Amino acid sequence: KLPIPSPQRAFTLQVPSMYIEVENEVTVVGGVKLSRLKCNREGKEWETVLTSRILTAAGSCDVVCVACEKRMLSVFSTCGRRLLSPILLPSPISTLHCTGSYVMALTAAATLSVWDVHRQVVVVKEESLHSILAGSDMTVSQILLTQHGIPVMNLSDGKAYCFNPSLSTWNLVSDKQDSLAQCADFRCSGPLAIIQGRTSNSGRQAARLFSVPHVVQQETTLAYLENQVAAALTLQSSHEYRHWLLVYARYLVNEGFEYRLREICKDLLGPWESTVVGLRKRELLKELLPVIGQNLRFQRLFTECQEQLDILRDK
Amino acid sequence: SAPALALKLPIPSPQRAFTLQVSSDPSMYIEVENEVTVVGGVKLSRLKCNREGKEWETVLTSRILTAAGSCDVVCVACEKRMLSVFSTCGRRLLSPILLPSPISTLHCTGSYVMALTAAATLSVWDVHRQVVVVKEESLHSILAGSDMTVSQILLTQHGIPVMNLSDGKAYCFNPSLSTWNLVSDKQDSLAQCADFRSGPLAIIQGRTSAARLFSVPHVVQQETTLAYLENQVAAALTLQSSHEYRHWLLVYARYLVNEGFEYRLREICKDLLGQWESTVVGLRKRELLKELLPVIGQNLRFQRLFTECQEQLDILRD
Amino acid sequence: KLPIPSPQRAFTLQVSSDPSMYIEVENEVTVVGGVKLSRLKCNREGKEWETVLTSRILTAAGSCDVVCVACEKRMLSVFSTCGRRLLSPILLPSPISTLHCTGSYVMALTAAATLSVWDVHRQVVVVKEESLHSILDMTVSQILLTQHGIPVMNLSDGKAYCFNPSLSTWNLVSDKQDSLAQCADFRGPLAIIQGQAARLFSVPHVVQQETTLAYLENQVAAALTLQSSHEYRHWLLVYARYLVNEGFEYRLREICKDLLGWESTVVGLRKRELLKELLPVIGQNLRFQRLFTECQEQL
């Protein structure tokens, strides 16, 4: 189970200062007991009434949402207009979280839902967290909801899983006890930085291992860098994806891994969806080409892309 | 550890024959005769369909338990948890669909087929587009705490299921949000105290056939009126009922203007005059905003906002 | 329920079949930092790539497009044909049992007999965690995986069910014991899954006509369910010729209306190129001259 917020006479909750006040069953109208939802944001205050008691609340710069007694979920605009019909959840609410126009409800049954209330679509449809934690005695130490409506569970053992909605999977994006980052020898703001944590302030070049042949450290470094690219992808973190894609590409250039390099260049050139995490794949290519060019070994690859880019410019 | 007892939806009994009036406007009768012959060891059941004196028929390889039909489709549910869907003139449209549990009831509206199973799951398919609309949603959430019944069941012309419960509550399933949504509630209705100036929502509510409050200050009646009208607008959107959405949005905007709800009507106008869909519920939003600006202009406090909206709108000569 | 592969020190598996594509796994070979590494190696034609993983590989699978591995702690990783990790490791809800890959389609069947299919090229799920308790009381047999990512399960009772991703359903596309094929009288993956009729002495001709109708309509719908495009063309036009020859006018007109115009394509073919191909079979019957005429609508 999960702790269910107990009924109260009234309460206040904070969240860019803005807060929520709730007063339950303050008045009666046509036989219907009313509960009040007040939102104090900057200078302006809005309010509204609901026909059942408010158990918990959450809000963002765009959205206020409220979990009420009869397993009901209501969502209101930045200025207090009801956005959606009340949502019946299959289990009593445990916690609510909002990020932008994304609303996340975690129920007492340990299931997790995420809606995009601006677009009026589900993002994460009732994902059990048993399916993650399994027979292991772990604990979801934290839970974050990104600006894309992507949930991330930081577990007690150092592993972080985030749900990919298009793949409909939980995906490992950090494992502090099996990280390859200290081994990784190659030439902060976003989500991936925050989840992994060692992104506090540590961009130090790593040392060559005295313990293993060079090829082992090369493969550890490859694997680490491809993990970072992949992870920024599943997290849909556009800026982090660009950063790691460029670092990885530089490493491929400097170590001479031609097949992986040509492969990503082909994928970024197309002949296919022209975008990844909302970036133009060919603009990403065009950003990599100078790095490719600084190594004479790839002069033809650099040239091929460049020429195939110019032909693309001439519609 | 299983419950000693768990209610289920009932499964139609095997019958040798039955007929069923499945059509109204184009009146349509369906006849079923089960296990009437054998070919190659395979026992066959017959399905017959009568529409306006024209008659088609076909055979199935298992007993037909129940059936439904519209102007567009006829579908049958059979033992071994199979569902088959046939065109208006009798052609099988899709492979037999394996249901997760035995059928209980079938409904059709246009090309939408809805199956409610013994396990109390609900499915809706658009057989014209051949896409699932509602994927095996448990009815447990809606039924827990009820009196074990559902008074009425609608499948709207956009394939949305609506459950009207005896306690006055109606829940519809929204396919995009993927939620059960409360779109009506006669007991907790704010409608009787709301003071302001054929569709699905109209049917679900008892409303197709207000006083000043003495006990509370005027602001409370305004807030109940606002909550009610927002509920109506949201309910119409959830039902994807376009005429009713436009109607309630227009009443709601008139109210916001009358009582001077500045920030709410600002928000609504910004949304209607725009990552932005030009459409809601199959309507051109800017057209609706144009249908507002009369009402908004009718008030002095919103002169600036009417001017700005007719401005950026008239900038559509470009 | 289903069996889990047991840990090994090393193993090899031929995966693809276009060239000899071999895969070699060496579990926990070296330690970088405190991290034990397992090696993944892939040989295809003359080319060898490799990479490391941080947990032990339990089984592998692959195709001309991808190699994927299932590891301990219920993890699933996917790599390009150059050894590049394509996706973050995927947490399976239950330990793996088997893996299949067809092109860029990856299918996991876990020990809890739940089945999943991902399109790793487009990065979308095809089949999201489908239990086989429902589709299975008989036991299972061969599991196929088509080139559009459709799962197909042949069961021990002769029935095959394939999972349509759009309808999100299990659909019956073959049933040997109840097959209407032996008695039907008319003159890709569906062939593979399924495997002149005498006239019947024991039933009236109308029963064999309806059985033949239902069989052909089943074949059309099964090809359309399997997304097998050439089999759909074939069976549509065999069925259409049965309709023409036997005089079933309303089914025929209906097919023409649909193919005329509304979605403009079917199973990746132009719905009007099909009307073009079956206008002449309509034309060889005098009774349907008007229909062959009424379809002369061009533009």
Structure, described:
- Chain A: Residues 1-142 are annotated as: Interaction with histone H2B.
- Chain A: This is Protein HIRA.
- Chain A: Interacts with histone H3-3B, PAX3 and PAX7. Interacts with histone H3.Y. Interacts with CCNA1, HIRIP3, NFU1/HIRIP5 and histone H2B. Part of a complex which includes ASF1A, CABIN1, histone H3.3, histone H4 and UBN1.
- Chain A: Residues 54-315 are annotated as: Interaction with histone H4.
- The structure is a homotrimer.
- In chain A, strands 1-2-3-4 form a 4-stranded antiparallel beta sheet, with no helix packed on it. Chain A has a 4-stranded antiparallel beta sheet with strand order 5-6-7-8, with no helix packed on it.
- Chain A has helices at residues 130-133, 191-196, 214-234, 238-255, 258-269, 281-293, 299-313; strands spanning 10-14, 18-29, 32-41, 44-50, 54-59, 63-68, 72-77, 82-88, 93-99, 102-107, 111-116, 121-128, 140-145, 151-155, 159-164, 169-175, 275-276, 279-280.
- The first copy, chain A, has 2 domains: 1-178, no CATH class; 190-307, no CATH class.
- Chain A is an alpha+beta fold and 315 residues long.
- Chain A binds chain C through residues 131-132, 134, 161, 164, 166-173, 175, 177-180, 182-183, 209, 211-212, 216-217, 219-220, 222-223, 226-227, 229-231, 233-234, 259-260, 263-264, 273, and chain C through 30-35, 37, 47, 49-55, 74-75, 80-91, 93, 118, 122-125, 128-129.
- Strand 8 (82-88) of chain A pairs antiparallel with strand 16 of chain B.
